């Protein structure tokens, strides 16, 4: 089977410019496990980025959590790029704080 | 406390 990843870009806490927060990209519901996930800042891949180990849910679909320490600013755009065999092209998802 | 399957699929 093959299941396209579900992606959620968000901050650990509600954003507050000038205040330290955490940027998370919760990739979930995918299969096979082989997945590629990156966090972006103004379109550039953020170097040091951690993520959970790997797991799956009742439906067997896998899920990780990519994350990084960051301080939101008025104009800094953040996004998550994900690549899985289900995706014909890397799927990018913008961080919509005011969500 | 993990389990141990012995008969294979």
């Amino acid at each position: 089977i093959q299941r396209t990843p579900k992606i959620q870009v968000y901050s650990r806490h509600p954003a507050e410019n000038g205040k330290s927060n955490f940027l998370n990209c919760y990739v979930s519901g995918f299969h096979p496990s082989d997945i590629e996930v990156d966090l972006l800042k103004n379109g550039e891949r953020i170097e040091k980025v951690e993520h959970s180990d790997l797991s799956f849910s009742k439906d067997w679909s896998f899920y990780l959590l990519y994350y990084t320490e960051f301080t939101p600013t008025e104009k800094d755009e953040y996004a998550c790029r994900v690549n899985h065999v289900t995706l014909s092209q890397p799927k990018i998802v913008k961080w919509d704080r005011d969500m | 406390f993990a389990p141990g399957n012995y008969p294979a699929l």
């Binding site: 089977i1 093959q2 299941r3 579900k6 959620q8 968000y10 650990r12 806490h13 509600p14 955490f22 998370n24 919760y26 979930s28 519901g29 299969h31 096979p32 496990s33 082989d34 959970s52 180990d53 790997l54 797991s55 799956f56 009742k58 067997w60 679909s61 959590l65 994350y67 005011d98 969500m99 | 406390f1 993990a2 389990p3 141990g4 399957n5 012995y6 008969p7 294979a8 699929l9």
Partner: protein, 274 residues
């Protein structure tokens, strides 16, 4: 409320190598407390939870040893699995397993769990009687045929009902402060224009534990099920969870809608609006 322990094991074969990648992860009340990875430098179950540190060398030893056993088990099964589905060569495959037990508020057994899956699909699962099996497809039948002959179920049944239950009580005793704790959700509503005469209303719930939660929208009375996007509960990264629900409300008419949040640590259902 209920309590549980789960062991999600994953084995992924891969070409050019005869050692599939094995990753086992144990959870308690759906919280990682142990992990094992065949790709680490020195494979061994590691404590993923603070209360798991008190375990002595004997403990980790036995646990790791079992993981070594599982790798062989998954290495083999994966092989037979390839034959069952007349599959080819140098492809990558995935065999997963979930094991564990559920307990009631009273710490007495509720369910025994054991079920495998091949390629993300159901393959074979021990039924709630802990005596019979259920094969998802034809192939799986052969495994059942063989598993009934060997009487494997009795062996798993024993684990699920004895050691699974017993060891969960312990972890619960040790993880008292961590596990049996609860964080009330913190809710709020947000506005956004969606269509021409419509508006999107989002009910937010943040920083809550356990994950389990209920978010509902409703028009000044009865609940709502149409055009109500409820997002998959997600991890906050600090151990608490987040989730939200939206509903396409006609512009102007908005304070008519309300959302309620249901959660353990909640003295009474959070109710709010825009």
């Amino acid at each position: 409320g209920p309590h549980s322990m789960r062991y999600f094991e994953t084995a992924v074969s891969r070409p050019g190598l005869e050692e599939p990648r094995y990753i086992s992860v144990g959870y308690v009340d759906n919280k990682e407390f142990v992990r094992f990875d065949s790709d680490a430098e020195n494979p061994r179950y590691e404590p993923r939870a603070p209360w798991m540190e008190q375990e002595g060398p004997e403990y980790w030893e036995r646990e790791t040893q079992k993981a070594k056993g599982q790798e062989q088990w998954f290495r083999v099964s994966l092989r037979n699995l390839l034959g069952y589905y007349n599959q080819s060569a140098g492809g990558s495959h995935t065999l997963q397993q979930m094991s564990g037990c559920d307990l009631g508020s009273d710490w007495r057994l509720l369910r025994g769990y054991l079920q495998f899956a091949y390629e993300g699909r159901d393959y074979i699962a021990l039924n709630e009687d802990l005596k019979t099996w259920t094969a998802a497809d034809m192939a799986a039948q052969i495994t059942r045929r063989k598993w009934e002959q060997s009487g494997a179920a009795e062996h798993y049944k024993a684990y699920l009902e004895g050691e699974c239950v017993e060891w969960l009580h312990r972890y619960l005793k040790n993880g008292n402060a961590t596990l049996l704790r609860t964080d009330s959700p913190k809710a709020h509503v947000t506005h956004h224009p969606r269509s021409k005469g419509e508006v999107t209303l989002r009910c937010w719930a943040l920083g809550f534990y356990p994950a389990d939660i209920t978010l509902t929208w409703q028009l000044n009375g009865e609940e709502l099920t149409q055009d109500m996007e409820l997002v998959e509960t997600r991890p906050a990264g600090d151990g608490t969870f987040q989730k939200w629900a939206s509903v396409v409300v006609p512009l102007g008419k908005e304070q008519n809608y309300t959302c309620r949040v249901y959660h353990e640590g909640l003295p009474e259902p959070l109710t709010l609006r825009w």
